[PDB]
Amino acid sequence: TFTAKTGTNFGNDNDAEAYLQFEKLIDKKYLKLPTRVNLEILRGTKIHSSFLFNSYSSLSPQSILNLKVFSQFYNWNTNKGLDIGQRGARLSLRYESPTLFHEWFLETCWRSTKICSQGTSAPYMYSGTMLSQAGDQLRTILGHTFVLDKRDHIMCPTKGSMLKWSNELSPGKHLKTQLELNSVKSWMNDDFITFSTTIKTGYLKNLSSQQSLPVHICDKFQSGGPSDIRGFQTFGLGPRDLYDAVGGDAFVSYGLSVFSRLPWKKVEKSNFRLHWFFNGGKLVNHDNTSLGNCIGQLSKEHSTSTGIGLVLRHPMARFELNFTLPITAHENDLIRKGFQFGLGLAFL
């Protein structure tokens, strides 16, 4: 009924947010629907401060409103990078064994953008693109997210597929579309050899009146990292201005992985698997005229990598210790070959 709790949500680049959450299950004489407020204080190496009020409220047997009022400061694009002020509200309606849910939201957000790169480090975050991303902006964004997770485990999958289709419309500014598929197959009687494909594609159209009002660097697509195409640093792929990953307006990022259960007699009941993968993808700044020239550059010049490793699959995390070599790369990519620790929840 109060339940002050703790934990870690395990962030984008091997990173981790330590959080502290309060809660109150509310009686039925302010409301009549089951309401569940929250208050999250988050802590991390990237986060400066993060307050996150929540208000979940079951409208139906299959309906959950979620008024999320947030005010978060966090750092971004790690060499020294940018720290993002981000405050606003978000009213999300989520609608409903294959897991199936739609989730429409609506989010107002005043967003600040410091370049905290401390210019003694000379050419980093001081390109012409990043110098124009600095400043304040206010943005309403409409959204939709459909998930058709048919897998039998979102922890240690063995069968099933997945389909994550998330559209985001900032009216008059941009329209972000993103697709994500997954497919897990197994071939032996112990679920021994686990084949796993992941393909993620996305498109970002500028709906802004003769190509004014550019899309912010935090909304563009980024590629590379351990929770992405392994073998490169985070924000390591795509086009650059000077040395800064300025993101792309369209991308594809495929993946293949085999898990082989660590064939020793004592330890073959555990979550340790032998991991060979093959990742790769492309991140382009398209011209907004044709979907045919968007696909045309999205299949010509890819940055791929394979690599052998070991993977542990815990409840809240998937620990990956890969040795990775990039087969094919672009020129201006940020290579991370050799050993690489992977940690998080979303790998592709």
């Binding site: 210019g119 693109t129 110098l131 124009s132 190509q211 020129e331």
Partner: protein, 300 residues
Amino acid sequence: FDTFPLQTYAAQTDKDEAVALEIQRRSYTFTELTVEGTYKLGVYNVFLEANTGAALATDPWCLFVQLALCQKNGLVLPTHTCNHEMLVLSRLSNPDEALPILVEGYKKRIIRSTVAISEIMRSRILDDAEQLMYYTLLDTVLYDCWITQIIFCASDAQFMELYSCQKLSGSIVTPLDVENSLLQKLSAKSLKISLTKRNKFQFRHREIVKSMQGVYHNHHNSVNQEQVLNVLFENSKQVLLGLKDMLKSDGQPTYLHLKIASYILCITNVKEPIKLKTFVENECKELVQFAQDTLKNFVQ
């Protein structure tokens, strides 16, 4: 084994065309070589000089460095091939959060901040001790009046016209303009707070900067705030009435003559009747004429 990237590609030279359209509508190129030898002066905003027709920066420090860059290199001011352009930036393009910066070079790119530029500008007049006295007086007394007249006495629309890189249309007609006019209400105070940390304004005027941080504007502070602003203004008139007796250049304009001219050109750009604008237009007509005679050294 350092041979393992088997195919090493080209550099993926496709760029976002909408981003380079705002690096073009914020750049004001200085008319008279390479790409590693040209710098980009960062400014808060820009205004069209009504008499001459030149893009001048809206801040007396951003305009003074702009005129000092024209004199040092023999440039012409931009009208409102790898030249020395100006650049309307945000304060948040810095950890220092103070915009008169210098983005020198392309590949080996040096950033000289406002504290770093102020040391360069002050060191060019350290030979004459008397000119350093006046230069410190405009940087302290005349500066602190201008900052208080524009943060407290001018409205939110007049501060954000001069000190914000946000856009303006004038008329609320579209739903984009409602949202753009809620940025000027939400983010007005944070740009005011950031401006008070530029010339150690936060250290000379610690108690009126402290009242800016607070909500609901405690009533005893506002009576004491009018006392410091009136003392700063009556000091500023004695500066401005004393400047008129030495505006005689026997050659190129000195770094003090560009310093005086950058204050008169930005005070007379204020559309609202702040007391500095009412003073320099009615009682200091010899200063307004001087601030156009020195501007005509850097135009065509």
